[PDB]
């Protein structure tokens, strides 16, 4: 990695210079080209979940990693996502997830968008939660405060902080 790149990523993340270098070394070992593809990205999820189909979910995640939307995950995009998810504040992690779930990038997560997300998660992996639809109904019942079938960032952030298991999950 070049020094100006190194300095820039340190300045933009919760990592030190040495930590950024160590991550680069790890990133290049797993992805020698330095330009991670959809398939490459999917293997991360097949671990953790080797008994479902992570194709759909892996795509949604690949798109929020792909900050410049050029079709590849380069290191700077990888390290920045990683900064948020491993060391972000709860608010920051929730912003990033909001961005993951807001498929059309308006300022709203519709029930349908959330449905696509939860269904993809189910395909990747209790009676009350045994279908995506039940999970989504539970989410909107807790978080959609004005009952318009859409979650704003605030609704999402506050709704997620209200639930102790979400707080626990994002520790």
């Amino acid at each position: 990695l070049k020094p100006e790149v190194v300095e820039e990523l340190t300045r933009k993340t919760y990592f030190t210079e040495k930590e950024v270098q160590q991550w680069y070394k790890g990133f290049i070992k797993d992805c020698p080209s330095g330009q991670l593809d959809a398939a490459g990205f999917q293997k991360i999820y097949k671990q953790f979940f080797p008994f479902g189909d992570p194709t759909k979910f892996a795509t949604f995640v690949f798109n929020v990693f792909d900050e410049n939307k050029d079709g590849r995950i380069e290191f700077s995009e990888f390290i920045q996502a990683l900064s948020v998810t491993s060391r972000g504040t709860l608010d920051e992690k929730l912003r990033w997830a909001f961005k993951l779930y807001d498929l059309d990038n308006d300022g709203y997560i519709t029930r349908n968008e959330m449905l696509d997300i939860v269904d993809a998660i189910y395909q990747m992996v209790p009676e009350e939660e045994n279908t995506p639809e039940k999970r989504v109904d539970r989410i909107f019942a807790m978080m959609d405060k004005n009952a318009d079938g859409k979650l704003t960032l605030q609704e999402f952030q506050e709704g997620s902080k209200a639930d102790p298991s979400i707080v626990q999950a994002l520790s």
């Binding site: 953790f48 995640v61 990683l82 972000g88 997830a97 939860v118 992996v125 999950a169 994002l170």
Partner: peptide, 12 residues
């Protein structure tokens, strides 16, 4: 990479 997984899929 476990943190990526948790932050991504937590809403389920």
């Amino acid at each position: 990479l476990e943190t990526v997984v948790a932050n991504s899929a937590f809403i389920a």
